[PDB]
Design a protein around this ligand. Structure first.
Ligand code: CL
Ligand code: CL
Length: 127
């Protein structure tokens, strides 16, 4: 499914992402917009043989297991296929592990390049 902006903000808030590990909700909505365009089924293949999966583009080298990525670590202990559900539970739970690993939201390239440093609260305005 393709979430609307406020629809995703409300779901992310129910799943505990607002201010999680120091990141206000607008960070997570902005991240999803530029990572997946709010589509829970987005996938993108990388040069290293990994693939990024779902609404938050979680990577198959470090975080989820897709069975075809060399050097897999599966630190979220989840099959990547579960991250293509229209229900964001599995992606949120893995995102919480990622953002707790020591480099904050810098794991998300699109967030680093296109959200960080902007007024991210605008992404939840009007909701
Ligand atoms: Cl915010
Ligand atoms: Cl998989």
């Amino acid at each position: 499914k393709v979430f609307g902006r406020c629809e995703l903000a409300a779901a992310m808030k129910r799943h505990g992402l607002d201010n999680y590990r120091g990141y206000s909700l607008g960070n997570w909505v902005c991240a999803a917009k530029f990572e997946s365009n709010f589509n829970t089924q987005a996938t993108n293949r990388n040069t290293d043989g990994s693939t990024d999966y779902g609404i938050l583009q979680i990577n198959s080298r470090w975080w989820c297991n897709d069975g075809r990525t060399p050097g897999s670590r599966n630190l979220c202990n989840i099959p990547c296929s579960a991250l293509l559900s229209s229900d964001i539970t599995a992606s949120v739970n893995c995102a919480k592990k990622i953002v707790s690993d020591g480099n904050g939201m810098n794991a998300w390239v699109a967030w680093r390049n296109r959200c960080k440093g902007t007024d991210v609260q605008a992404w939840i305005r009007g909701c």
